[PDB]
Amino acid sequence: STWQTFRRLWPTIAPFKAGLIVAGVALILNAASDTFMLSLLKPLLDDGFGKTDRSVLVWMPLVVIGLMILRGITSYVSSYCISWVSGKVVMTMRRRLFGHMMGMPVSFFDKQSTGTLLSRITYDSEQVASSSSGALITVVREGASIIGLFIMMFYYSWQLSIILIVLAPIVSIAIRVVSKRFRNISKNMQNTMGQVTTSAEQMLKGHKEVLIFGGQEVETKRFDKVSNRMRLQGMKMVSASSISDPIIQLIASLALAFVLYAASFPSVMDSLTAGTITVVFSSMIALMRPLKSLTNVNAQFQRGMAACQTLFTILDSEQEKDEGKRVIERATGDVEFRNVTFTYPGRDVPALRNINLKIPAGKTVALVGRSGSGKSTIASLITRFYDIDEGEILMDGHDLREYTLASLRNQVALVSQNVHLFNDTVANNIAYARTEQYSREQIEEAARMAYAMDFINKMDNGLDTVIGENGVLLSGGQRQRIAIARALLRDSPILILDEATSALDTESERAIQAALDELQKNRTSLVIAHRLSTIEKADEIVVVEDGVIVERGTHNDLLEHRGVYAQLHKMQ
Amino acid sequence: STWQTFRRLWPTIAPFKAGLIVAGVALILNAASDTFMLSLLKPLLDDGFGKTDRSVLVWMPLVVIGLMILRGITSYVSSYCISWVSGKVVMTMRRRLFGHMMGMPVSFFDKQSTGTLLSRITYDSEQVASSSSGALITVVREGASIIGLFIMMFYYSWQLSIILIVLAPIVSIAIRVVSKRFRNISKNMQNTMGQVTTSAEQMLKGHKEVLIFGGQEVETKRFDKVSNRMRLQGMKMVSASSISDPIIQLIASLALAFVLYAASFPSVMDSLTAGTITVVFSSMIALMRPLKSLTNVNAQFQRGMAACQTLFTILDSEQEKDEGKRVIERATGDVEFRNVTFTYPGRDVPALRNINLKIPAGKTVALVGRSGSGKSTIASLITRFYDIDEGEILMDGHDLREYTLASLRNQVALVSQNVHLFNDTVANNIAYARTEQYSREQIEEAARMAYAMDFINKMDNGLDTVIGENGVLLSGGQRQRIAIARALLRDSPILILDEATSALDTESERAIQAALDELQKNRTSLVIAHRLSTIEKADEIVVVEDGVIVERGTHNDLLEHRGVYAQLHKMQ
Numbered sequence A, B: 001s002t003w004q005t006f007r008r009l010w011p012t013i014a015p016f017k018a019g020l021i022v023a024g025v026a027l028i029l030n031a032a033s034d035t036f037m038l039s040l041l042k043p044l045l046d047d048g049f050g051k052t053d054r055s056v057l058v059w060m061p062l063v064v065i066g067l068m069i070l071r072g073i074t075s076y077v078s079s080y081c082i083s084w085v086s087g088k089v090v091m092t093m094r095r096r097l098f099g100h101m102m103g104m105p106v107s108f109f110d111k112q113s114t115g116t117l118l119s120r121i122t123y124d125s126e127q128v129a130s131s132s133s134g135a136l137i138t139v140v141r142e143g144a145s146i147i148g149l150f151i152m153m154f155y156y157s158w159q160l161s162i163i164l165i166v167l168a169p170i171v172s173i174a175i176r177v178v179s180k181r182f183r184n185i186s187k188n189m190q191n192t193m194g195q196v197t198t199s200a201e202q203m204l205k206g207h208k209e210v211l212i213f214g215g216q217e218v219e220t221k222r223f224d225k226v227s228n229r230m231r232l233q234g235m236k237m238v239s240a241s242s243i244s245d246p247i248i249q250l251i252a253s254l255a256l257a258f259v260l261y262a263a264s265f266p267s268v269m270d271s272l273t274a275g276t277i278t279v280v281f282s283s284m285i286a287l288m289r290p291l292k293s294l295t296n297v298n299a300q301f302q303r304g305m306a307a308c309q310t311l312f313t314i315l316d317s318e319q320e321k322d323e324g325k326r327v328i329e330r331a332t333g334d335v336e337f338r339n340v341t342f343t344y345p346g347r348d349v350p351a352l353r354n355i356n357l358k359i360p361a362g363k364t365v366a367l368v369g370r371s372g373s374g375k376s377t378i379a380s381l382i383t384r385f386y387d388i389d390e391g392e393i394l395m396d397g398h399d400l401r402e403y404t405l406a407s408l409r410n411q412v413a414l415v416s417q418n419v420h421l422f423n424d425t426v427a428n429n430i431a432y433a434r435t436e437q438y439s440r441e442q443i444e445e446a447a448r449m450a451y452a453m454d455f456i457n458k459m460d461n462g463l464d465t466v467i468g469e470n471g472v473l474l475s476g477g478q479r480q481r482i483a484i485a486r487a488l489l490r491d492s493p494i495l496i497l498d499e500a501t502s503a504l505d506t507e508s509e510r511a512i513q514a515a516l517d518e519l520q521k522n523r524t525s526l527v528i529a530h531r532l533s534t535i536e537k538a539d540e541i542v543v544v545e546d547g548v549i550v551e552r553g554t555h556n557d558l559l560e561h562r563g564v565y566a567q568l569h570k571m572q
Ligand SMILES: C[C@H](Oc1ccc2ccc(/C=C/C(=O)O)c(C3CC3)c2c1)c1c(Cl)ccc(Cl)c1F
Pocket: A164, A167, A168, A171, A172, A175, A248, A249, A251, A252, A253, A255, A256, A283, A284, A285, A287, A288, A289, A291, A292, A295
């Protein structure tokens, strides 16, 4: 199943064919030069030696020098042009693949990790590029070499050529059966690999359990046995790998010796002089390598095309499905969660069960709970990063999923100290998507209201300073201030803040708190605060623990009573 | 700094020299056969053209076959013997390395995970073996080849030999400067490598942060720019390699052409016949790959030896130091922790601060706290898995660190459902540390008292059934029962159990609870229980939260009052 998916891959290189033609003529001319080198070397030098070498002997070195200059030039041109085509095609493939990955659910990003994801992407792209390019160049160049060497062989005493071509099927089938016999079964030695991995793993905390049990000699004996086993397995693998090649080499020498013995038959040395037999056998020795190269590159073609297929499968699986198609721009902000039921993949215990809550506009709602609880899940669900597994939430008389994903996600802004900064200038990062729609004067006024004047003055480039640099030049407080400024500039109707990830150990936090209060004063919001002042200033507080509401009552009455809530706040 | 650390490595193979000598004679004879092939081919073939064609032309195909049989036999023998030596030396090295890591503190097992430790060890061992073996075999074989081909060259018209040997220093410095010029530095492309990862992770979990911006076009443009840059960098690297190689090829051809033009000078064709020049040039061509490999193996030797050096550093780094040297076997069990202060590496907030507690013998102490709290750290410190950073704990009038590590860890037994199962038989895993000192009748009686009769009867081999199999054949309840049986058989004076990792969703738990109560009835212990019945049956309960005691009082009085503790138990 490779032809169909190679044909499907043709369009991404269809307009890129001038480089292919340039490489395809460069490689053919390269093989032609390679054959023509032997052509003008061996017979001319070994036949002009008979009282005529005075001219051809000094003629030869210039020919050799020019031929090698041509061969090197063609090699450089072909490699550079194939690299150009491969770079352009991987550029296009990476671009489309990243574009597809950006607009697809967050769960995929969760159940992979950034490092392994990007390693997969880049490594697989370069792998398919290298495999396909190598297969193409080897097929073209070595097929041209085989054709040229057969042409020269038939032009020089076709009898040896026909002997070789009739011996070819026997040698080929012998090599095929030997190679098939000498391929091992890689489905048993994994038991030893897994066993040693477990003994390292089940006996690390089990080393604590080995120390607790006191046994150290038993582990050494067990590792002795398993290491002896894996050493034996590896030695057997090396023995197979080293018994493979000499058999093929010996069969090749049987073929060459049979050809030489056929040459021993008379009536053909009459037309065969020293130069002719010399060039014929040199042609055979040169032809030795290309066939092995051809088989190995068919193998690597299959290998790389498998990776191309799995990359296509990765590109094809699902997307950001917009089943709603009921776009409602400029949402009023009627927030009310009901019948919330969702769980992480694989797990069978839902994070929330029949959770019901209301966050009316114009009122302040405080989210209080332990770190690592379901508050983060609820906040993510409010932004519809991951759709609720069960239940439905209706906003302003319409379902949350009914509204367009872009429309819903645009009306909500989340500000947190853990919001990383995009690798762009500070002015650019303040307007990550509204750079062209925001006036410079308005942005400057917002930044002045963002309490960033002290940071702007200290900046070398002021408001145009390049922020980011993998977080080396940006601090946590600066990142939080930039996030607050971005939220204020966006001025979304509903704001959900996650202060749990923030650290309270801040030297200067009063200004940040005042700025946050000013930003949240005009627009109603429900933030998960972690400060006593913010909790006290909240208009309404709902007690929810472990994704469930345990106590219901007025926030002011609960604060005045100072019961379980006060003790919990004092403890944490 | 390679000679000294290679000399330090000599003892591990010093007794192992018969295989080295066998390989060293096999490789020399292989190179001799390689030279002797061209030897008896070319001048004798020329003598065939001199009216002696029938005599030698039928004689060649048998010499060729015999020579290739000898070459293949020597290749197989040398590869097999070198593999045997390498396998045995890495066997010894792996054994010693595993023995060293067994007795060295726990933090290593944590700060590298099991995969990035064992893959490290196995890959590095096979890497150093392959690198050293390849360097040795290439140096010996290819030096023998160079010596033999120069011997033939001097034996046949030494003029060309001296003409090339005088050119060798000229060519070798040009090759050295050319190779250096194209040895690029990898200093800046990592910025793009990290930049693409930053761009991916910025909106991966920050799709809502991408939605905070509200657009994806900016991300697509940024990825366009960065992908163009990285494609250009890869283009430049490929171009550098593809201009590097043909320059050396062309310089080699200049050298060969100059040799041929020197042969064009008269007064030396008088002693040079067609076969002589043929074999001379064949030798010159054949030497091309040898010197390339001989010049390249330095890099591979260094690359392998660096991995060997870092393996030595890993084997050297610190140890399980027993600073106590005050072994007190058969401890009474006077448990009292005081001034406990310890933190994880890197962090600046200690897990516990001036923690003081007492667990007198003959009394039951219950450890109650939230999941993931400092109870696990306290339990680990009681077993001295990781020494306390600050403070001191005295047991039975002597410091905890004063007693021998083996002696201290032997007197304490930890039973939990997460206890890993050793890859051995059920009977073997029951006495994983004291199999030889345990009577069969006593083990059978303990197993009968272990409530394992139902599982033993269902086992195909009964008590001799092979447990483990990477946990496929063992269930969580069976693992917990086996751990309880092992603890009962050991019958340590002090038992610390971690029931937090256990799962309460067990179909049959009454028998396990009864067995645990029977095991803990005779010997006093302080276990971290998670069941209401176990908490109620506890003689003394201490309220500790966040590594600190908030409330102090009688357990019975607190239970009767049913205040904060009852509400916390009902909630969780
Ligand atoms: C008659 C024969 O043809 C063939 C036909 C299929 C082959 C498939 C694989 C390989 C090598 C695989 C490897 O090295 O792993 C060879 C060989 C030895 C060169 C093949 C030679 C032939 C040989 Cl045996 C020698 C020289 C010439 Cl010119 C030749 F045609």
